[PDB]
Amino acid sequence: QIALQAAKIVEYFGIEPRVAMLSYSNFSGAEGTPRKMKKAAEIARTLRPDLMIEGDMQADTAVNPEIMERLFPFSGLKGGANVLVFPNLESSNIAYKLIQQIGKAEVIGPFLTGVRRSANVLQRTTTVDGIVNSVVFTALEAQFIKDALKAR
Amino acid sequence: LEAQQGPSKVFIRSAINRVHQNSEANGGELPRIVFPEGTSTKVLKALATLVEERICQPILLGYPERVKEKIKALDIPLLNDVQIVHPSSHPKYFSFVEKLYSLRQRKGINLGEAERLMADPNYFAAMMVNMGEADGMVSGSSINYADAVRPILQTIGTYKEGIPAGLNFVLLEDKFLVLADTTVNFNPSAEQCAQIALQAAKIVEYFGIEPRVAMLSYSNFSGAEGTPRKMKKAAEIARTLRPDLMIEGDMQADTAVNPEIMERLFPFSGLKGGANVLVFPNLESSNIAYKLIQQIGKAEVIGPFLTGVRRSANVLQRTTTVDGIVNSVVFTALEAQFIKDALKAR
Amino acid sequence: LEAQQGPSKVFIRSAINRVHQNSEANGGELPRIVFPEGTSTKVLKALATLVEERICQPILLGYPERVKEKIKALDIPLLNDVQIVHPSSHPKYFSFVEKLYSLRQRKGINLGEAERLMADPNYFAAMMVNMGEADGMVSGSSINYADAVRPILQTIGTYKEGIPAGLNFVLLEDKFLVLADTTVNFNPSAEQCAQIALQAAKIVEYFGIEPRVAMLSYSNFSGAEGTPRKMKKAAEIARTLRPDLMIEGDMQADTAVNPEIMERLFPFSGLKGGANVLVFPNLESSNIAYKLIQQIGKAEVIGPFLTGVRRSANVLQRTTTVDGIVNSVVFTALEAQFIKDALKAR
Numbered sequence: 001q002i003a004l005q006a007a008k009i010v011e012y013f014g015i016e017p018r019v020a021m022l023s024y025s026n027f028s029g030a031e032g033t034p035r036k037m038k039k040a041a042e043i044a045r046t047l048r049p050d051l052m053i054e055g056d057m058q059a060d061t062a063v064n065p066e067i068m069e070r071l072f073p074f075s076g077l078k079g080g081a082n083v084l085v086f087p088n089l090e091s092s093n094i095a096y097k098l099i100q101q102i103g104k105a106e107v108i109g110p111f112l113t114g115v116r117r118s119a120n121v122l123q124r125t126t127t128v129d130g131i132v133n134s135v136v137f138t139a140l141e142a143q144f145i146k147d148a149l150k151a152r
Numbered sequence: 153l154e155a156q157q158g159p160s161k162v163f164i165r166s167a168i169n170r171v172h173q174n175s176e177a178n179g180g181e182l183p184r185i186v187f188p189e190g191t192s193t194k195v196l197k198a199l200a201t202l203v204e205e206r207i208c209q210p211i212l213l214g215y216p217e218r219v220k221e222k223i224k225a226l227d228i229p230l231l232n233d234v235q236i237v238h239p240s241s242h243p244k245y246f247s248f249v250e251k252l253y254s255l256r257q258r259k260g261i262n263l264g265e266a267e268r269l270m271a272d273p274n275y276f277a278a279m280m281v282n283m284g285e286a287d288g289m290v291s292g293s294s295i296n297y298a299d300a301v302r303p304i305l306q307t308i309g310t311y312k313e314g315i316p317a318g319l320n321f322v323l324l325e326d327k328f329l330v331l332a333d334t335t336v337n338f339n340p341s342a343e344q345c346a347q348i349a350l351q352a353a354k355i356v357e358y359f360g361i362e363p364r365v366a367m368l369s370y371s372n373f374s375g376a377e378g379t380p381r382k383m384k385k386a387a388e389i390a391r392t393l394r395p396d397l398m399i400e401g402d403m404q405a406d407t408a409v410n411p412e413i414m415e416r417l418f419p420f421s422g423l424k425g426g427a428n429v430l431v432f433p434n435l436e437s438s439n440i441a442y443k444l445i446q447q448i449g450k451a452e453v454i455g456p457f458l459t460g461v462r463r464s465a466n467v468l469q470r471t472t473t474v475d476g477i478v479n480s481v482v483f484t485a486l487e488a489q490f491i492k493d494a495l496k497a498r
Numbered sequence: 499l500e501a502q503q504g505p506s507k508v509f510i511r512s513a514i515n516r517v518h519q520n521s522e523a524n525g526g527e528l529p530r531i532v533f534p535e536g537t538s539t540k541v542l543k544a545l546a547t548l549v550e551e552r553i554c555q556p557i558l559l560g561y562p563e564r565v566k567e568k569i570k571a572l573d574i575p576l577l578n579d580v581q582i583v584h585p586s587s588h589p590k591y592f593s594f595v596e597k598l599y600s601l602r603q604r605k606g607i608n609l610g611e612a613e614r615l616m617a618d619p620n621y622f623a624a625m626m627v628n629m630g631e632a633d634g635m636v637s638g639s640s641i642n643y644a645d646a647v648r649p650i651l652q653t654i655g656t657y658k659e660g661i662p663a664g665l666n667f668v669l670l671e672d673k674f675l676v677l678a679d680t681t682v683n684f685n686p687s688a689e690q691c692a693q694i695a696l697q698a699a700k701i702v703e704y705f706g707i708e709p710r711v712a713m714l715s716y717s718n719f720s721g722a723e724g725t726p727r728k729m730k731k732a733a734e735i736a737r738t739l740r741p742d743l744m745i746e747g748d749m750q751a752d753t754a755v756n757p758e759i760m761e762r763l764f765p766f767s768g769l770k771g772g773a774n775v776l777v778f779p780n781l782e783s784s785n786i787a788y789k790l791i792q793q794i795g796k797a798e799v800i801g802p803f804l805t806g807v808r809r810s811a812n813v814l815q816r817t818t819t820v821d822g823i824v825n826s827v828v829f830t831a832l833e834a835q836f837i838k839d840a841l842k843a844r
């Protein structure tokens with residue numbers, strides 16, 4: 001369900017979503033997180049048959065098309081994933097915070113999805129520019145939701 | 153002046169220089185590094201660079217004819233004189249079989265099973281490293297981490313009060329971070345996390361940098377049930393085991409690695425100046441974080457390095473490249489030189 | 499008249515004669531049995547007798563040289579025209595590697611690991627049996643059961659609504675009991691126990707004997723929580739699956755195999771005349787019981803036989819003798835001929 005919500009959000013920006021269920025194993029399907037991610041990928045593929053959903057895999061395999069093509073050509077995900085789904089809260093939280101801090105790539109969020117109305121919570125360690133970006137995207141989501149409500 | 157020479161590429165160059173210095177000190181002796189993936193293409197392509205750079209002395213493993221054919225087909229002339237060893241044809245193969253049978257006789261390995269296992273290049277490389285025939289081994293370039301590191305832990309083992317862990321170096325523009333166990337333990341306990349932090353602190357101190365451990369979590373000093381409680385307890389245990397260090401937890405990644413956020417939000421914490429050792433609550437977080445930082449972040453990460461084992465023994469991720477293999481072999485040669493020097497001091 | 503001709507003196511001879519009749523009716527073509535342990539003393543010693551009795555056609559696995567040297571040392575003149583093949587040098591080695599990579603790509607095996615796995619004699623033999631190049635395989639005489647049977651289940655697998663399960667024949671003077679299962683399942687549930695009972699009943703009925711199943715336990719129709727409840731439920735499930743059968747449970751071992759005790763104490767039970775197939779609660783009970791009956795009992799047991807697999811594939815116990823090997827290979831030949839006939843008829 002999280003992958004489907006993220007796919008809808010990505011499709012809102014005119015980008016074809018490619019979903020990867022991250023793990024610490026590469027298509028191993030072993031006990032624990034790998035089996036859960038494999039089942040999640042299967043369920044997501046069943047729910048939205050037209051999507052490019054694959055799992056389980058690791059982050060480098062997911063976000064590098066060359067690695068996936070060279071090592072795992074059997075997988076149905078090609079071109080590199082743009083949606084990443086994490087097995088638990090610690091992994092996603094730590095990964096996104098570390099990418100925000102030590103990486104040179106901008107990170108905007110977190111945005112609360114799955115709620116009826118537009119309502120966002122900023123991280124307590126945010127900056128002024130982070131608040132500006134979050135408010136911009138909250139305004140975007142609020143306008144979208146208001147238009148959808150008015151249409152009905 | 154000195155702040156403009158951060159370890160972006162100076163770290164690997166300094167490691168190579170230290171390897172050369174240690175080799176020169178010990179009578180110009182290059183550590184013998186065993187590569188059980190003799191027929192791997194990336195292994196040989198990195199070995200060409202390594203032997204050109206005068207870092208280690210490779211000892212390939214497998215059938216000599218097939219290894220020579222692969223070298224000839226891959227067009228590497230520098231690897232024409234390498235001690236290719238067939239595990240079954242070695243003179244000390246039977247001694248290795250007997251030693252492995254003696255080690256794990258009461259763990260499901262008798263003489264027949266030990267003889268069958270020692271034909272596996274991973275097990276023979278582990279025996280070579282353990283029995284002093286070599287200084288270190290590099291494996292895992294073509295197999296998953298579990299089945300490439302199981303021979304090392306079963307044969308070489310871990311020293312007393314030591315837990316195996318996968319340690320990564322994220323070399324930023326000014327300071328290098330150390331990511332704690334990224335490869336071995338699924339859900340380490342508080343004591344295991346404290347031991348991993350101590351091992352990472354020792355490795356950092358080997359490089360002349362004061363270690364400042366931080367137990368990562370999703371909560372900022374919350375102490376709530378689950379991961380935050382485990383990380384807070386692990387920080388307390390690590391502080392007990394080493395009261396002269398800057399260990400603090402639990403916290404989030406931004407709070408740990410940013411001095412300004414920690415100073416503004418949580419001035420009570422004993423971690424000042426930012427953290428350079430980050431310990432992760434479980435395997436998924438550490439693994440995904442390190443791989444994502446490697447790929448989408450311009451910072452260069454090197455590893456994972458197996459820590460806690462008695463002798464030098466490393467496992468490359470199957471996802472690696474030639475440069476990654478070169479860096480990992482350089483650092484495993486450095487570690488093998490250190491271990492050999494320490495063993496020759498008793 | 500029929501009393502003086504009992505299983506303990508006629509069963510193996512009848513099995514051999516049935517092998518001979520099935521071979522004669524198919525044009526005198528012996529079943530091709532692949533032996534992964536080509537350099538095993540017991541395997542070759544039993545292969546001498548098997549070739550003398552023309553039960554099967556052996557295909558030893560390993561490098562042709564060490565196997566030939568072992569044959570020369572052990573002085574078996576018959577094992578000189580036998581087929582010795584090397585897994586890596588076979589003309590169909592890469593097809594087998596591709597097949598394993600295709601059917602196990604999402605279970606942790608890719609080409610780099612499939613090529614390594616097919617080098618192992620056990621995996622190569624399992625793939626040969628799966629692809630039809632050999633009728634059956636007989637392994638496990640040099641390694642433990644778990645690592646010998648893992649490639650069989652990974653490659654050959656199980657058929658529809660089938661569960662892997664051991665099966666041993668205890669040949670008494672008057673009748674023969676069938677213990678199942680003794681090798682695979684650690685602690686089967688009620689449904690798994692019912693399926694094992696159905697498989698054992700089918701195998702018993704193949705030998706022209708009406709099967710009577712008993713779900714063994716430590717209690718006599720107590721229905722208490724734990725194992726007795728599991729066996730009561732398993733007996734009910736098996737009765738629902740095969741109404742025409744005579745299945746009873748739960749009961750103790752002595753009540754099942756003694757008609758007098760059952761008719762005196764529990765006349766209400768639907769098992770009349772004594773059980774000839776016995777299903778055990780867990781692995782410890784069945785393994786210990788069958789091994790103790792084999793050793794300290796005067797009744798000869800043969801097995802264990804791996805049931806529930808699509809193709810013919812048996813794993814010997816590592817503590818077996820030459821006679822055990824020849825009996826197991828005879829019954830493997832019977833099963834392989836049955837499987838081949840069923841596949842051809844389809």
Ligand SMILES: CC(=O)SCCNC(=O)CCNC(=O)[C@H](O)C(C)(C)COP(=O)(O)OP(=O)(O)OC[C@H]1O[C@@H](n2cnc3c(N)ncnc32)[C@H](O)[C@@H]1OP(=O)(O)O
Nearest residue numbers: 008009012114115116117137140141142144145148149152
């Ligand atoms: C990046 C961007 O710009 S975002 C791009 C993608 N965005 C999205 O997909 C937005 C997704 N969300 C939405 O579209 C909106 O939430 C909508 C239009 C679906 C509204 O959700 P709805 O539930 O239909 O809202 P609505 O106000 O019509 O309420 C109807 C339902 O809400 C329930 N409801 C109303 N008030 C409440 C309440 N306080 N608590 C709980 N349920 C409530 C009603 O019971 C009713 O349920 P029912 O039909 O089963 O009886």
Ligand SMILES: CC(=O)SCCNC(=O)CCNC(=O)[C@H](O)C(C)(C)COP(=O)(O)OP(=O)(O)OC[C@H]1O[C@@H](n2cnc3c(N)ncnc32)[C@H](O)[C@@H]1OP(=O)(O)O
Nearest residue numbers: 024297298301302305306315316334335336337439456469
């Ligand atoms: C860069 C990357 O790609 S990271 C990939 C993600 N990581 C992985 O997939 C691997 C995850 N880790 C694992 O699976 C396990 O840690 C493995 C590799 C040890 C699996 O081996 P296991 O099935 O757990 O153990 P096994 O029974 O084979 O025994 C291995 C040995 O390791 C030892 N060992 C394993 N973990 C520990 C530990 N935390 N502390 C001490 N010893 C340990 C055991 O004691 C055992 O030694 P022994 O037989 O002498 O007692």
Ligand SMILES: CC(=O)SCCNC(=O)CCNC(=O)[C@H](O)C(C)(C)COP(=O)(O)OP(=O)(O)OC[C@H]1O[C@@H](n2cnc3c(N)ncnc32)[C@H](O)[C@@H]1OP(=O)(O)O
Nearest residue numbers: 311312354355358460461462463486487490491494495498
């Ligand atoms: C540099 C980096 O980047 S990482 C820096 C930190 N890394 C580290 O590994 C930290 C340093 N730690 C170590 O090197 C390890 O603790 C080791 C290798 C010293 C421990 O190895 P151990 O075998 O556990 O050492 P231990 O203290 O038990 O000594 C082994 C003893 O066995 C004896 N011994 C006798 N026969 C043998 C044998 N066949 N094999 C091994 N030891 C033997 C040795 O003589 C020695 O006794 P001694 O001290 O009287 O000479």
Ligand SMILES: CC(=O)SCCNC(=O)CCNC(=O)[C@H](O)C(C)(C)COP(=O)(O)OP(=O)(O)OC[C@H]1O[C@@H](n2cnc3c(N)ncnc32)[C@H](O)[C@@H]1OP(=O)(O)O
Nearest residue numbers: 605643644648651652661662680681682683785802815816
């Ligand atoms: C005479 C003697 O020597 S008896 C000695 C005592 N017996 C033993 O020690 C063996 C007992 N059994 C075991 O130890 C194990 O359960 C084994 C060896 C059967 C395999 O278990 P594992 O090693 O965990 O299996 P693994 O994860 O490798 O999977 C192997 C395959 O077997 C299959 N399998 C295993 N048990 C069953 C079962 N009861 N029903 C159906 N399939 C099964 C799995 O589905 C798997 O197939 P897959 O790859 O398509 O998913």
Ligand SMILES: CC(=O)SCCNC(=O)CCNC(=O)[C@H](O)C(C)(C)COP(=O)(O)OP(=O)(O)OC[C@H]1O[C@@H](n2cnc3c(N)ncnc32)[C@H](O)[C@@H]1OP(=O)(O)O
Nearest residue numbers: 628657658700701704807808809832833836837840841844
């Ligand atoms: C004698 C004694 O003491 S034991 C007596 C008791 N024994 C038994 O009851 C054993 C029962 N088992 C059997 O008869 C067999 O193992 C079977 C029939 C269950 C297995 O046969 P299968 O391998 O499943 O298939 P079979 O070859 O018969 O049928 C062909 C089908 O197999 C399918 N198939 C799938 N994978 C394969 C493969 N690797 N090889 C061949 N066929 C395959 C084909 O697609 C084909 O389907 P299709 O004809 O609809 O297109």
